[PDB]
C-alpha cells in the first residue's frame, strides 16, 4: 500500500556495508559521463589484473586518484574497516531508487 509502507530491511546477501548497492550503480553511471581513454585503459588493467566489478574498478581507481597499482592495493584489500577517513561522508537523494515512480 502507498500509505503505510513498512517492510523489514532492504539488503541483498552479497556485499556488506553501505555505499556498494544502489549508489555504486549511480556512481559508475555518473563517473561514466566523465571518463577518458587513460583511465579507461587503467580500469581494464584493474580488471585484467584483479578482475573485480568494473564499476568497482572504476570507483577504486578514481578513489585512489588514477593509479592501477594504487587501486590494486585498495582493491586487493582496502580500508581496515575505518569509521571515517578520506572522502566526504554525506547522504543524498531525490526520492529513492533510480527509476520506478514515473507514471502508471
Curated annotation (Swiss-Prot):
Domain of life: Eukaryota
UBA domain sequence ranges: 38-78
Phenotype seen when the gene is deleted: Ubap2l knockout results in a lethal phenotype in a majority of embryos. Mice with heterozygous Ubap2l deletion have cognitive impairment and behavioral abnormalities, including lower preference for social novelty, mild repetitive behavior, anxious-like behavior, and abnormal spatial working memory compared to wild-type mice. Stress granule intensity and numbers are reduced in developing brains of Ubap2l-deficient mice compared to controls, and neocortex development and lamination is abnormal.
Membrane-spanning segments: none
Localization: Nucleus; Chromosome; Cytoplasm; Cytoplasm, Stress granule
The protein's role, per its UniProt record: Recruits the ubiquitination machinery to RNA polymerase II for polyubiquitination, removal and degradation, when the transcription-coupled nucleotide excision repair (TC-NER) machinery fails to resolve DNA damage. Plays an important role in the activity of long-term repopulating hematopoietic stem cells (LT-HSCs). Is a regulator of stress granule assembly, required for their efficient formation. Required for proper brain development and neocortex lamination.
Oligomeric and partner information: Interacts with BMI1. Part of a complex consisting of UBAP2L, BMI1 and RNF2. Interacts with G3BP1 (via NTF2 domain); promoting stress granule formation.
Protein known as: Ubiquitin-associated protein 2-like
Entire-sequence positions represented here: 19 to 109 of 1107
Amino acid at each position: 500500500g502507498s500509505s503505510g509502507s513498512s517492510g523489514n530491511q532492504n539488503q541483498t546477501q552479497h556485499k556488506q556495508r553501505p555505499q556498494a548497492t544502489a549508489e555504486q550503480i549511480r556512481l559508475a553511471q555518473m563517473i561514466s559521463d566523465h571518463n577518458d581513454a587513460d583511465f579507461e585503459e587503467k580500469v581494464k588493467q584493474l580488471i585484467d589484473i584483479t578482475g573485480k566489478n568494473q564499476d568497482e574498478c572504476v570507483i577504486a581507481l578514481h578513489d585512489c586518484n588514477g593509479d592501477v597499482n594504487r587501486a590494486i592495493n585498495v582493491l586487493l584489500e582496502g580500508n581496515p574497516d575505518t569509521h571515517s577517513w578520506e572522502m566526504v561522508g554525506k547522504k543524498k537523494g531525490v526520492s529513492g531508487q533510480k527509476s520506478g515512480p514515473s507514471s502508471g
